[PDB]
Amino acid sequence: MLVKGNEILLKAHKEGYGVGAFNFVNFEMLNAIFEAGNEENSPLFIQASEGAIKYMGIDMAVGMVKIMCERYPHIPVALHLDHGTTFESCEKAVKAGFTSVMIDASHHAFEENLELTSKVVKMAHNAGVSVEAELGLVNPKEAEQFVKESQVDYLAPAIGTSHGAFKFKGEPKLDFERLQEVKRLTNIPLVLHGASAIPDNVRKSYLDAGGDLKGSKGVPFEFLQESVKGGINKVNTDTDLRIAFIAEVRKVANEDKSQFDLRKFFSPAQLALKNVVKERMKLLGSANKI
Amino acid sequence: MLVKGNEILLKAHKEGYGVGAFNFVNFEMLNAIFEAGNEENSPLFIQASEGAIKYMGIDMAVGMVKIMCERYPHIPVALHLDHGTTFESCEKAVKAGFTSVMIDASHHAFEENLELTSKVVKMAHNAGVSVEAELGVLVNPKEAEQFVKESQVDYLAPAIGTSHGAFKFKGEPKLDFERLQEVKRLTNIPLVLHGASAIPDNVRKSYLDAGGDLKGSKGVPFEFLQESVKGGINKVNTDTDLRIAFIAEVRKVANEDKSQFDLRKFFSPAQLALKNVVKERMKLLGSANKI
Ligand code: NA
Ligand code: NA
Ligand SMILES: [Zn+2]
Ligand SMILES: [Zn+2]
Ligand SMILES: [Zn+2]
């Protein structure tokens, strides 16, 4: 059922594996994510950004997730506010039924990031909700201080990732020795943002359907595994899903100009998304952890 | 709020207007339909086919609608099983929370159609749910009178020359309006028009400008939809129009930005185009400003 984000991530912290945190914006993405979790016997972090919540309405975002939990009552599921920008945003998500909220004030200085994060934590913990924060590259000693002062449940340390399909213009590399240092001093679950890899087969599908991925590329599979070894426990994944989904939508549009049955577009798009999720669960080590 | 289908259609029947019955298969379709009803102050018939229910899961089909009703509690909404093919399917819909169910046995003989329809009615009415059936081969008005009286069905879909899909008329648009009037006077219940998509000219242009192909497509003219309401049609099944308007915008976004893979950029304009189709249809049929 729907559980506190910390319940899932504490396990992954103790046993040293990574749980994927998969964004959704509608029913098709959510269904494919849940089907993958059921087929790989993996716990699920379900994420909604503030833009996705505006698109769906927060009543629908939580409502659809609750329905899916009743459909697969054996899968541990956390519903996570992705990149909350204000206290009030995190507070609205708590009242709506989210079991995990992230407050992104990494763009602020240490002192204001910590003051706002601490405010979110108090409100959230009062309602039984776990909190993620961000910091950053990261400096391990202030991370130690940040975590102890804020009492946040998980932390996203900056180690060389960024959202989108365009992660590194040159060689891909992440500062894993910084990560191991953060992990030691904080001893809490850690979060990797911008962790989409753009698998080879997903890139092929998008470009085969006439898509333009520009010079985009993401974290190699090897560096996601090394991140988990370093102590990452929550791996944010979104771009990979969207590319795999829209590749199939473009394909159907191209191959049959007379097709306007929505299910003919989105049934193959769901399957491609679902396979990206299933492979990621195995890569990160959360398969068969229910 | 979610109400029995008859509560909406009996009002439409008494006052002589039509209520669009709009199919959905996912959240985007459902949201646009509800926004159209809110903006035109119109009651809503929300329909799901058996295929749509398989795609969504009946728990999600009903659950999404109940969330949307809480979001717009002032809008009368019926949740209708479209083209139920078996008693068991209609019974599952009743148990899940549907407020209206259609049993389509029109391909069976009259006697078998009546028997199955009557079985569905008894189960449905015991649960507080309204029932649609279908007759027609064009409908036989005298069969309809007997059918409605023996079955106690709440509304009837008489065949008068329409059909599902974008290719309804090879030749002249033709609907047997005389037959419709006879059925209405003999049955005196709300009547349903299936295959009622019109394929507006702007929707067709949109689909073709996006690179789509509609070879000789042809729907029910707006004037025929109005004539059919004047004749006693109170429920107007609409699906194809919604899908063409929706996918037209999906095709357009794909064509004009090959680097776009944010789903919202595809489906926000698609929702708006679908919503606009629904708003115009609500005004055409006369359910606008009836809340
Ligand atoms: Na997050
Ligand atoms: Na129907
Ligand atoms: Zn991020
Ligand atoms: Zn971030
Ligand atoms: Zn029909």
Swiss-Prot record, chain A:
<feature type="active site" description="Proton donor">
    <location>
        <position position="82"/>
    </location>
</feature>
<dbReference type="GO" id="GO:0008270">
    <property type="term" value="F:zinc ion binding"/>
</dbReference>
<feature type="binding site">
    <location>
        <position position="83"/>
    </location>
    <ligand>
        <name>Zn(2+) 1</name>
    </ligand>
</feature>
<dbReference type="Pfam" id="PF01116">
    <property type="entry name" value="F_bP_aldolase"/>
</dbReference>
<feature type="binding site">
    <location>
        <position position="104"/>
    </location>
    <ligand>
        <name>Zn(2+) 2</name>
    </ligand>
</feature>
<comment type="similarity">
    <text>Belongs to the class II fructose-bisphosphate aldolase family.</text>
</comment>
<keyword id="KW-0456">Lyase</keyword>
<comment type="pathway">
    <text>Carbohydrate degradation; glycolysis; D-glyceraldehyde 3-phosphate and glycerone phosphate from D-glucose: step 4/4.</text>
</comment>
<keyword id="KW-0479">Metal-binding</keyword>
<dbReference type="GO" id="GO:0030388">
    <property type="term" value="P:fructose 1,6-bisphosphate metabolic process"/>
</dbReference>
<keyword id="KW-0324">Glycolysis</keyword>
<protein>
    <recommendedName>
        <fullName>Fructose-bisphosphate aldolase</fullName>
        <ecNumber>4.1.2.13</ecNumber>
    </recommendedName>
</protein>
<dbReference type="InterPro" id="IPR011289">
    <property type="entry name" value="Fruc_bis_ald_class-2"/>
</dbReference>
<feature type="binding site">
    <location>
        <position position="164"/>
    </location>
    <ligand>
        <name>dihydroxyacetone phosphate</name>
    </ligand>
</feature>
<feature type="binding site">
    <location>
        <begin position="194"/>
        <end position="196"/>
    </location>
    <ligand>
        <name>dihydroxyacetone phosphate</name>
    </ligand>
</feature>
<dbReference type="InterPro" id="IPR000771">
    <property type="entry name" value="FBA_II"/>
</dbReference>
<comment type="subunit">
    <text>Homodimer.</text>
</comment>
<comment type="function">
    <text>Catalyzes the aldol condensation of dihydroxyacetone phosphate (DHAP or glycerone-phosphate) with glyceraldehyde 3-phosphate (G3P) to form fructose 1,6-bisphosphate (FBP) in gluconeogenesis and the reverse reaction in glycolysis.</text>
</comment>
<dbReference type="GO" id="GO:0004332">
    <property type="term" value="F:fructose-bisphosphate aldolase activity"/>
</dbReference>
<feature type="binding site">
    <location>
        <begin position="236"/>
        <end position="239"/>
    </location>
    <ligand>
        <name>dihydroxyacetone phosphate</name>
    </ligand>
</feature>
<dbReference type="GO" id="GO:0006096">
    <property type="term" value="P:glycolytic process"/>
</dbReference>
<feature type="binding site">
    <location>
        <position position="163"/>
    </location>
    <ligand>
        <name>Zn(2+) 1</name>
    </ligand>
</feature>
UniProtKB/Swiss-Prot annotation, chain B:
<keyword id="KW-0862">Zinc</keyword>
<dbReference type="InterPro" id="IPR011289">
    <property type="entry name" value="Fruc_bis_ald_class-2"/>
</dbReference>
<feature type="binding site">
    <location>
        <position position="165"/>
    </location>
    <ligand>
        <name>dihydroxyacetone phosphate</name>
    </ligand>
</feature>
<dbReference type="InterPro" id="IPR050246">
    <property type="entry name" value="Class_II_FBP_aldolase"/>
</dbReference>
<dbReference type="GO" id="GO:0008270">
    <property type="term" value="F:zinc ion binding"/>
</dbReference>
<protein>
    <recommendedName>
        <fullName>Fructose-bisphosphate aldolase</fullName>
        <ecNumber>4.1.2.13</ecNumber>
    </recommendedName>
</protein>
<keyword id="KW-0324">Glycolysis</keyword>
<feature type="binding site">
    <location>
        <begin position="195"/>
        <end position="197"/>
    </location>
    <ligand>
        <name>dihydroxyacetone phosphate</name>
    </ligand>
</feature>
<feature type="binding site">
    <location>
        <position position="49"/>
    </location>
    <ligand>
        <name>D-glyceraldehyde 3-phosphate</name>
    </ligand>
</feature>
<keyword id="KW-0479">Metal-binding</keyword>
<dbReference type="GO" id="GO:0030388">
    <property type="term" value="P:fructose 1,6-bisphosphate metabolic process"/>
</dbReference>
<comment type="subunit">
    <text>Homodimer.</text>
</comment>
<feature type="active site" description="Proton donor">
    <location>
        <position position="82"/>
    </location>
</feature>
<feature type="binding site">
    <location>
        <position position="104"/>
    </location>
    <ligand>
        <name>Zn(2+) 2</name>
    </ligand>
</feature>
<feature type="binding site">
    <location>
        <position position="134"/>
    </location>
    <ligand>
        <name>Zn(2+) 2</name>
    </ligand>
</feature>
<dbReference type="GO" id="GO:0004332">
    <property type="term" value="F:fructose-bisphosphate aldolase activity"/>
</dbReference>
<feature type="binding site">
    <location>
        <position position="194"/>
    </location>
    <ligand>
        <name>Zn(2+) 1</name>
    </ligand>
</feature>
<comment type="pathway">
    <text>Carbohydrate degradation; glycolysis; D-glyceraldehyde 3-phosphate and glycerone phosphate from D-glucose: step 4/4.</text>
</comment>
<feature type="binding site">
    <location>
        <begin position="237"/>
        <end position="240"/>
    </location>
    <ligand>
        <name>dihydroxyacetone phosphate</name>
    </ligand>
</feature>
<dbReference type="InterPro" id="IPR000771">
    <property type="entry name" value="FBA_II"/>
</dbReference>
<keyword id="KW-0456">Lyase</keyword>
<dbReference type="InterPro" id="IPR013785">
    <property type="entry name" value="Aldolase_TIM"/>
</dbReference>
